[PDB]
Symmetry: D2
Subunit: 267 residues, 4 copies
Amino acid sequence: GLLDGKRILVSGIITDSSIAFHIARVAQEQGAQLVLTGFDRLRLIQRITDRLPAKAPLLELDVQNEEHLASLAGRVTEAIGAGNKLDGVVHSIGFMPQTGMGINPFFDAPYADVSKGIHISAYSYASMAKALLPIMNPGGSIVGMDFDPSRAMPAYNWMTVAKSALESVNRFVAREAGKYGVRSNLVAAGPIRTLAMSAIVGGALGEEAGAQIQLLEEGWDQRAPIGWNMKDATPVAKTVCALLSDWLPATTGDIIYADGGAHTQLL
Amino acid sequence: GLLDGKRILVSGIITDSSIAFHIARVAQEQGAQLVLTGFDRLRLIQRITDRLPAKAPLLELDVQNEEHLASLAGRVTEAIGAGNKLDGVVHSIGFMPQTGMGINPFFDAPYADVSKGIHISAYSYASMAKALLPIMNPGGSIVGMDFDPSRAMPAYNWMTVAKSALESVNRFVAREAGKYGVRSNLVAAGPIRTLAMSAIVGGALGEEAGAQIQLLEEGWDQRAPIGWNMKDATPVAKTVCALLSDWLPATTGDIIYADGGAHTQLL
Amino acid sequence: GLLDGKRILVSGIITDSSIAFHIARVAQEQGAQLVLTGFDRLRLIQRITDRLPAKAPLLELDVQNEEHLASLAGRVTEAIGAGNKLDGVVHSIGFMPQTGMGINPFFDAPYADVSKGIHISAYSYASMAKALLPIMNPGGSIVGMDFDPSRAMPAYNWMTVAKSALESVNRFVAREAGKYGVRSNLVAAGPIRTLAMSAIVGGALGEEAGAQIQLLEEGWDQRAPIGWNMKDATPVAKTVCALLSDWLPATTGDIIYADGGAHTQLL
Amino acid sequence: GLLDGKRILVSGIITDSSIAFHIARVAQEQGAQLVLTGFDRLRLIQRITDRLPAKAPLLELDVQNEEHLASLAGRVTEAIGAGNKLDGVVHSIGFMPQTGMGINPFFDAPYADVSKGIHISAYSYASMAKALLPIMNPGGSIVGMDFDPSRAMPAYNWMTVAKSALESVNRFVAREAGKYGVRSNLVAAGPIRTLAMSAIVGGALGEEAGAQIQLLEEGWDQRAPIGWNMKDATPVAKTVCALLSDWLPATTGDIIYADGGAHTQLL
Ligand SMILES: NC(=O)c1ccc[n+]([C@@H]2O[C@H](COP(=O)([O-])OP(=O)(O)OC[C@H]3O[C@@H](n4cnc5c(N)ncnc54)[C@H](O)[C@@H]3O)[C@@H](O)[C@H]2O)c1
Ligand SMILES: NC(=O)c1ccc[n+]([C@@H]2O[C@H](COP(=O)([O-])OP(=O)(O)OC[C@H]3O[C@@H](n4cnc5c(N)ncnc54)[C@H](O)[C@@H]3O)[C@@H](O)[C@H]2O)c1
Ligand SMILES: NC(=O)c1ccc[n+]([C@@H]2O[C@H](COP(=O)([O-])OP(=O)(O)OC[C@H]3O[C@@H](n4cnc5c(N)ncnc54)[C@H](O)[C@@H]3O)[C@@H](O)[C@H]2O)c1
Ligand SMILES: NC(=O)c1ccc[n+]([C@@H]2O[C@H](COP(=O)([O-])OP(=O)(O)OC[C@H]3O[C@@H](n4cnc5c(N)ncnc54)[C@H](O)[C@@H]3O)[C@@H](O)[C@H]2O)c1
Ligand SMILES: Cc1ccc(Cl)cc1NC(=O)[C@H]1CC(=O)N(C2CCCCC2)C1
Ligand SMILES: Cc1ccc(Cl)cc1NC(=O)[C@H]1CC(=O)N(C2CCCCC2)C1
Ligand SMILES: Cc1ccc(Cl)cc1NC(=O)[C@H]1CC(=O)N(C2CCCCC2)C1
Ligand SMILES: Cc1ccc(Cl)cc1NC(=O)[C@H]1CC(=O)N(C2CCCCC2)C1
């Protein structure tokens, strides 16, 4: 298997449609031994991850909780055994209050809300690296999930701004992680029809926002030279596993686009 | 003059070495009528701006103060006269707590501090646009100051992240400003030896940070095909005035590099 | 006027819809004294440029002709008078054989044809700089016309490749031009409905190619936060004049987007 | 093995220091069955490739020879057996006449020489795709070698321009290759001390050119957060194999940076 013998921490599972769920599944299919982290609804997350191919300990991690972050390495070590370290870390965490997305006007989002989104979606990539680098092996790999923010788009609003911040954080995390012989990269995925995204398309954050996302999805598959299936997270999960493997050893501070090639085409 | 008859708001003057001071001077030399905004030390700022070629009303604006922002358009209107609107707005505002820059480790900056920096340096570009767009004329221009954050660099740390966020905010502000017939752009300047920058080089945020910035400056002038003089803000001020003028009417959501061409050269 | 007293060479006029025609008109309105260069049909070009606001000498220049390039500086000097030099040069030249564009398959373009297109559209920017830099004043400006090639698009095919090459040539020309105190930049324009472009939309290079360009144009105005009028070259001409002026003195090796802001927006 | 059962064509071997030699070695270590192509010195190339872990047929291919390209698919089919197709193609071909590189002035390179370099280094990526796509399996992968040309640099001169053209060609090739279910990507490698590169450093294309490349190499390892070893092609070869594998299935028209992360860091 691609990840045989690797110990990998995967954050961000909340439903069976979470990108992290598919990352975890593919990593286990490829021989990785996982530790999972979940936010707030741990009973739910345990029941969800019961469906993964193999057993994996679940640890609580709210990335806005300083105590959780300060205890995290020790809790991971307890889970994988003293004297063992991680080979991989997956950050698949994102959040923006509803004022910061959808039809809610861009100018009307209070900074308190934007700040909460940037905390969870961008600063926490650095928070997790700080917490886990001391228990990572040389040759290891930190991977985060990104959505290409280099151009503005409808409805994504401040979440786009948070992703622009994350891309910058990643380049700095790479400097720190390099001291440990560890790589840091993001995977910029195309749109994936998770539960929350389906709810948005259905109008949860306003009708015109749903309409705009639907147009965005359609354009994506049209632009993608090999097409793009928003209902299939597996290609994205495979790409994360590629970055976790030994096969991209000279790539760091970087962004790998798992988007069907859409970002390379104007139309 | 390039800006004859234009009413322009300029924020960000705090010393005679502020980039905004030079923007204001050049804009006045080119016929613009200014309104100035200053943060906290208004007596100081008034004494500083007494040295500008012409009189300009000074208004208080702390961009973290919701009341200041809510009253700003009315205060500007009072200063320029009912029935008059602005043709231009200059955002020359930036701040990051010392934990977020210098030799202070990247991972050690508390989010409260980073958030304060992002508030002032990135979110406030949107805050000011929200406040002022309703009193801007079609054909008008909003300009912000940027430092190219597309690559990580030593010591700049979270301020780089804030600039990455600002570049994203600018692209969204352009969408809103377009509804008013108004352009929004950033000027990415090379390093300018302001008071604070000279203090950093002198070691105020740690010795190795000062050393690294000094190396950065030297490399900049070396890379720049037409050279780069860190002691001369005038080229930057001229570029801001170009964007405030009628001569770049089809440019918005964009970044103009006033950096000697350094970002186009590897070495 | 913005360009009062400046001596500027403008290449690329062939019809009254040429972008160069509008560049020349605006530059003359702003006080510039022009020298024009034309390819092959000089009687036609003279009759066309009779419609410009002021008289300007016309010189023959085929950029594939080594003798024309070797004699060009002396012929310009004769036209502007011994002891006078140019302050500006405008390259508004492009060509790709029909095999290299339209519905003709990308893989079917013979290299001889592609090479001819790259010669005229990219290498000639360096050819002209070589020829003219020795008779340019410090503070001068070389400007070329570009169409953003960072993403592939239908029908533009090898012309896109030639523009990618031109952007690279520009960054090297900036290194050479810097030795003379001269700037070199491109203006990346949105689509402009010139004679040839109208013919393409009308199906001259195949029906589906025309259809695709029409979709491209429509999308452009939709994406542009301030809109985009393909029938109006004046905004582009103004931008070229901005670069020819003294108001962007620290920009070189760079690309200024005169495209309504469309390239900053995904949709 | 990562590439078990895959039939892959590898071009560009000329010495045991060729990047293609290391690509071929790693691909064979991972179970790939190779077909090799060589230019001009086939006796030499056969003796060189005798050192690879396994036997691989060698075919002649001069990419400037239309007859070679027209016969190539049939010759490959003969080598791998009727009814078998390729899963992968590696383009590791580049050339620029000495007038187009080194201390020879940028402006002094004759177009005939530049054109020859662009033919071999950029157009041939499309030539090979045209030739081989009809005998490639769905899920297949075309990979080319790139050196990041987004910024100008000393001495690389017109080869940089050719790489800018190649990056554009790759985005179009991806459109064509998509019709076959095939991906097309480039790997942008850091500097590798091949025979020719060592000769350049030693002064073969002028003293100052050698000096500049040496400075470039040193800066590269300094900037790279995980370092960069110019004497080790294996990380680059592994990255090519990653792209040839099934593990990056949603990436096309793109560029993967195998450069130690140097391009993500300013200093
Ligand atoms: N869905 C897409 O279209 C798409 C596209 C590109 C990238 N991404 C990114 O992929 C990642 C995963 O998103 P997803 O689409 O799988 O949605 P998701 O809702 O399944 O995952 C988001 C995760 O963030 C977690 N989270 C929120 N607040 C947290 C906190 N305080 N502490 C810890 N975890 C917290 C949630 O519990 C959840 O597990 C995010 O970074 C998202 O931005 C998503
Ligand atoms: N100096 C450089 O090298 C350089 C390079 C590129 C860009 N820039 C940018 O140019 C802009 C101006 O910086 P500068 O170098 O002139 O330094 P400066 O210190 O003179 O200006 C920063 C300004 O921000 C103001 N400010 C801080 N907190 C504020 C608040 N709460 N509300 C309102 N204003 C507030 C300060 O009062 C000051 O006037 C900043 O955006 C900076 O990031 C500077
Ligand atoms: N029209 C658009 O949509 C558009 C958009 C962006 C950029 N541009 C660029 O603007 C420039 C001008 O194009 P245009 O649209 O005005 O079309 P145009 O046909 O009016 O101009 C092209 C010019 O190139 C000249 N030319 C061709 N071969 C030549 C040679 N051998 N020597 C000298 N001159 C030669 C032609 O005579 C003509 O004057 C080109 O670089 C084009 O790529 C055009
Ligand atoms: N060496 C580096 O520092 C470096 C860095 C990044 C990318 N690259 C790229 O990697 C690729 C391989 O270069 P390399 O460094 O291994 O050098 P190399 O000399 O070993 O390989 C270049 C190959 O191109 C072949 N070639 C030249 N003309 C040809 C023609 N007419 N038809 C077919 N093949 C022809 C040569 O025979 C040789 O096999 C090139 O694209 C190069 O630009 C090299
Ligand atoms: C592309 C786009 C446009 C507009 C809107 Cl409202 C949403 C999207 N898409 C998304 O929000 C996709 C991408 C993204 O970061 N998430 C996050 C998932 C976790 C909660 C915050 C949002 C889901
Ligand atoms: C380029 C660099 C590297 C490292 C450090 Cl510590 C500082 C700099 N440079 C600066 O901080 C320059 C650029 C910049 O945004 N400012 C801001 C000026 C206002 C207060 C916060 C910083 C001044
Ligand atoms: C954007 C696009 C797509 C497809 C096609 Cl066929 C044409 C265009 N557009 C153009 O060709 C525009 C842009 C451009 O470089 N020219 C050139 C004008 C001079 C002759 C060669 C083409 C005109
Ligand atoms: C980075 C740099 C700067 C200056 C010079 Cl002279 C050479 C280099 N480096 C190279 O030429 C490296 C990168 C590259 O494309 N090749 C090619 C190898 C095949 C023959 C043509 C050049 C080798």
